[PDB]
Write a protein that binds this ligand. Structure first.
Ligand SMILES: c1ccc(C[N@@H+]2[C@@H]3CC[C@H]2C[C@@H](OC2c4ccccc4CCc4ccccc42)C3)cc1
Ligand SMILES: c1ccc(C[N@@H+]2[C@@H]3CC[C@H]2C[C@@H](OC2c4ccccc4CCc4ccccc42)C3)cc1
Ligand SMILES: c1ccc(C[N@H+]2[C@@H]3CC[C@H]2C[C@@H](OC2c4ccccc4CCc4ccccc42)C3)cc1
Lengths: 205, 205, 205, 217, 205
C-alpha cells in the first residue's frame, strides 16, 4: 500500500490528466466484444437489447513507470475517473447505455490501460425473421463520437466476437457474431471515419 | 500532449468561464438536426419518441488562440463541463431528454465550439392517421429556455433536416422533415423570441 | 463578458449563499402555472400525469446591484445551483417530479429572481367520469415543505392557470384550471401554512 | 440573514459532523407514519406500493444554541446533507425507496432535529383477498440498517398510523393501519435489534368515504 | 461523540484511502448471501429478479486502532464512501443492480470491515419448468470485476445461503440455494480468477 499510494500520487497528482489525442500524436484504441445475451427483441419498435462486455485498450507514455522504483509493482487497478477514457459510443442506440460493472481500469507499467465496461444496449434492429430457421441479422457501429481517424485509430484483435460466455439458455441463439473495423471516406469531409461494426446473426432458440 | 495540456490550462484555469451572452454582447447559435429514428408512437397518450443528434455551433472570443504558440494545434476535444453551453431545450417534451452520446465538444483556434448531443426525446404529438398513405405531421420547437432573441440568436444553415442516416428499417418512414427558424413576439413584451421548429411528416412503413 | 464576470463574482464569491428566510425576515414567493398537457391517466392506480411549467419569483436584498457600476447590465441568467431556491413541492405526487428544462434562473438588478422549471408530475387523481361530457375534477397542492407562512409567504398573481400553451391535440381537453392560495393551520403551532391549490377540471377530448 | 448565517457557520463549519451514536452515547429516534395512498397492487409479483411521509425526530447536544446570541432565532431549516441522519430503512422493500419531498430538516435551539421524507415504496405483500369484504393484511418493518438497540433506540409516539391525509378517492380503503415498536434477537448476538412494524389492513374500495365513519372532514 | 470524532478524523483525515490490494499484499473478502425474495420471473426475456442482501467482510491493518486510546470504543458505523470497498459484482445481470439499503459499513478495532448491501438484481435465467413439481435451477456468479485471485481472494464461510428470512408468501418457493467458491484459470494469463457461484433451485409456490 505504501508503494502503490506513492505510484498513484506520482502518476495522478503531479500533473494534469492526459488531454486526449491530436493529429500529430494519435492514439490507437483496441476494441473487442464478449457477447453474453440477446435479452429481448421488440418487434413493435424494432429495438433489440444486448448484454455484453466491451474490452477497451490503449497505451499512454505518461502512465508509464519503472517497477523497481515502486516496490516491483507491475500493474494496478484504479477508478476510471482518475484517467482519460476514449469517448467510444454506439452510433445507433435508442436508450442511454446502462453500465453493469464497476467503473475501474487496470493500468500496466508499460502505460497500457485496460477498461472493460459491461453494458446493456438497446439499438435499432428489425427482428423480422427471428422465428425462422434462418434468423435475422442486425448491426451496430461503435466508434469515437468526436475524434476522427486522424486522432483515434480503432482496431480489433480478432474479427470473431467472443461467444465463450454467451448464455446457453438465452431466448435467442447466435448463428454468427463478428466485429469489423471500417474505414470510410466522404468527399464532403477531409478526415476519415473509423468504426467497429458489430454484426450479429441470430434466431429464436 | 505537452502543448495541448498547456493550452487547456491557459484557456480554462487562468480565467472564469464565459458567463453567457448579454444584450450588449449577443451570441448567435446554429442548430441543425440529423434524424435517426422514430422509435415509437403511443396513440393512448399522444406521445412520439425520436432519436436524433443535434449539432450546436457558436463562437467565443475568449476561446480563441494562436496555433503557432501551441505546437500548431488547430483544434481539440474537451468535456462539455469545461465550457459554457447554450440552454437549448425542446419546448413540448413529455419526459426528460435522454442523452445518447458522450458529452464532449470540439474547440477550434478561431473560438468556434461544436457540440453534438445525441438524444432520445418524447414529445407531444397526435399520431392519428399514421397508418394511412398520407401519414401525420408533428412539430416540436427548440430554443433557449431563459435567453430572449436579444441575447441568443438562433440560426439554421439549411431548412432540410439531415435524413442520410435515418434508419432504413425503422417502423415509420419519413415523408418530410424540416427545421425552421421562427420569430415569436408575446403581446406583453418588446424582446423577440426565437425557436427552431422541427416539423416531421411521417407514416407507418 | 468582463463586467458580468465581475458582477457574478461580486455577488457569488464574496459572501455565503442566502441561508433562506426566517420569522424576522420573511420572503414572499410568487407561483404561477402554465399547463401544457395532461399526458396520461391511469384508472387502475388513480394516477394522472401533468406537463407544465411553474413560474417562481422572489426578491433578495443580497442579489441587488447598481447597473452603472457594471456596464449598465440590468439582468443576467445563471445556473440555479448558484442561488438559493425555495423548496416548493407538490403535496400529493406519486413519483419524483421529473425536470424537463435547464436549471437556470434570471436575476435582475433590483434583486428579483425568476425561475421557471418545466416538470412532469404524477399525482393522486381519480379519473372516473373523464369519458363523459362533464369530465372529472382533480386537485394538487403546492407549497414549501419545511417553511411555514411566517418564513415563506406564497402568493399568486392570478387565480387562472395559463392555458395559452395547452397542447391543442392533447388527448384530454381542459374545462377549467385554477390556482388558489390557501392558508391552513394546526394546534401544535402558532404558524400558518400556505399552499397553492392547482384544481384542474378535464375530460376526454 | 446575518444572524442565521452566523449560526449555521458556527454549528457546521467550526467542528465535524456528529459521528453517530455509540453504545456509551445512544440516541433515541422517534418515528411516525402518515399514510397518503396505497397506489397499486401487483398480484403477479406480490408487491404493494405505498405513498407516505415518515416523521423522524431526535436530539443532539452538538446542535444546541442560545437564541439570545443569534438574534432570538429559535429554529431554522437546513439541507439534510448538512447534518447526520439515521439510516432508517424498510427491511422488506423490493425497489429503492423513491423520495418525493425536498431533503430539508428543521433544527431547534434545544438540539432537536425533525426530518420528514415523503416516499413511495414497493414492498413484499400478497394482496390475495384484496377484493373481498374482508381485505388483506400487509406488514413492513422499518429500522436502522447497521445500528443495534444499544446505539439507536427506536420509538413511536402512538401506535396509530395517521390517516387524516389518506387519499379519499384512492383505489384501496384502509380498515386499519398501525405502527408498533418491536425488539428482535438471534442466537449469534446479545445485542437487541429494533424496528417499527407498519401493519396495514385494506381492501378494494366499496363506498365513497371509506371503511370507518369519522366526523371531521 | 468526542472520542469517536477523534477516531474518525485520525483514521480518515490523516492519510489517504486504502488504494486496494496488490499481488504482494492480497486481501481476502468473505461473501455470503441472505435471500429474501424471488420477486418476479420473465419467461419472454429469461430474466429473474432477486431481492437479497450480501454480507461482505475484510480486514485492513490501516483501519486498526487501540480502544484504550479512544474511550474504549471497539467498533463504529460510517458511510461506505469514507472507506475502500471491493468491486464485487454479478457477472450475468441484465440491469444495473438496485441498492435497497443505506450505504454504511461497520468498522472494528481489529481492522475488520463489514458491509451488507441489500440489492435487487435482474439476471439471466430461463424459468421454463418453474410451474412443475420439479422447479428450475438458475445460477449467477459474483466476484471482483478487475482484481484477480492474486489480489482479491474470495471466500465463503458456508456454502449454504441463509433462507431464514425468505418471504413465506413469496410467489416462488426455494428448493435449494447454495453459494460456492470457484477458481478458473484462463490460457491467456498466469493468475487465477475466483467467483462465488449463487445457485438457486425454485418453483412456483
Ligand atoms: C464535429 C461535428 C460533429 C461531430 C459528431 N460526429 C460526426 C457526426 C456524429 C459524430 C460521429 C461521426 O458521425 C458518425 C458516422 C460514423 C461513421 C460513419 C458515418 C457516420 C455518419 C454520421 C453519423 C450519424 C449518426 C451517428 C453517428 C454518425 C462524425 C464531431 C465533430
Ligand atoms: C411553451 C411555449 C413557449 C415556450 C418558450 N419559452 C418560455 C416562454 C417564452 C420562452 C422563454 C420563457 O418565457 C419568458 C421568460 C423568460 C425567462 C424567464 C422567465 C420567463 C417568464 C416571463 C416571460 C414573460 C413574458 C414573455 C416571456 C417570458 C419560457 C416554452 C414552452
Ligand atoms: C462472464 C463470465 C465472467 C466474467 C468476469 N470475468 C471475466 C474474465 C475475468 C473476470 C473479469 C473480466 O476478465 C479478466 C480481465 C480482468 C481485468 C481487466 C481485464 C480483463 C480482460 C478480460 C480477461 C481476459 C483474460 C483473462 C482475464 C480477463 C471478465 C464476466 C462475464
Amino acid at each position: 500500500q505504501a508503494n502503490l499510494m506513492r505510484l498513484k500520487s506520482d502518476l495522478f497528482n503531479r500533473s494534469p490528466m492526459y488531454p486526449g489525442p491530436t493529429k500529430d500524436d494519435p492514439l490507437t484504441v483496441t476494441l473487442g466484444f464478449t457477447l453474453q445475451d440477446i435479452v429481448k427483441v421488440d418487434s413493435s419498435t424494432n429495438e433489440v437489447d444486448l448484454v455484453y462486455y466491451e474490452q477497451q485498450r490503449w497505451k499512454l507514455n505518461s502512465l508509464m513507470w519503472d517497477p523497481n522504483e515502486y516496490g516491483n509493482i507491475t500493474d494496478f487497478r484504479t477508478s476510471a475517473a482518475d484517467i482519460w477514457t476514449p469517448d467510444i459510443t454506439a452510433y445507433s442506440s435508442t436508450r442511454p447505455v446502462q453500465v453493469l460493472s464497476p467503473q475501474i481500469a487496470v493500468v500496466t507499467h508499460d502505460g497500457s490501460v485496460m477498461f472493460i465496461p459491461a453494458q446493456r444496449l438497446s439499438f435499432m434492429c428489425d427482428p423480422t425473421g427471428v422465428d425462422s430457421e434462418e434468423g435475422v441479422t442486425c448491426a451496430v457501429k461503435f466508434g469515437s463520437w468526436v475524434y476522427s481517424g486522424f486522432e483515434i485509430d480503432l482496431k480489433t484483435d480478432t474479427d470473431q466476437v467472443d461467444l465463450s460466455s454467451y448464455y446457453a439458455s438465452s431466448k435467442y441463439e447466435i448463428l454468427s457474431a463478428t466485429q469489423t473495423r471500417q474505414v470510410q471516406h466522404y468527399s464532403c469531409c477531409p478526415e476519415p471515419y473509423i468504426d467497429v461494426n458489430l454484426v450479429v446473426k441470430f434466431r429464436e432458440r
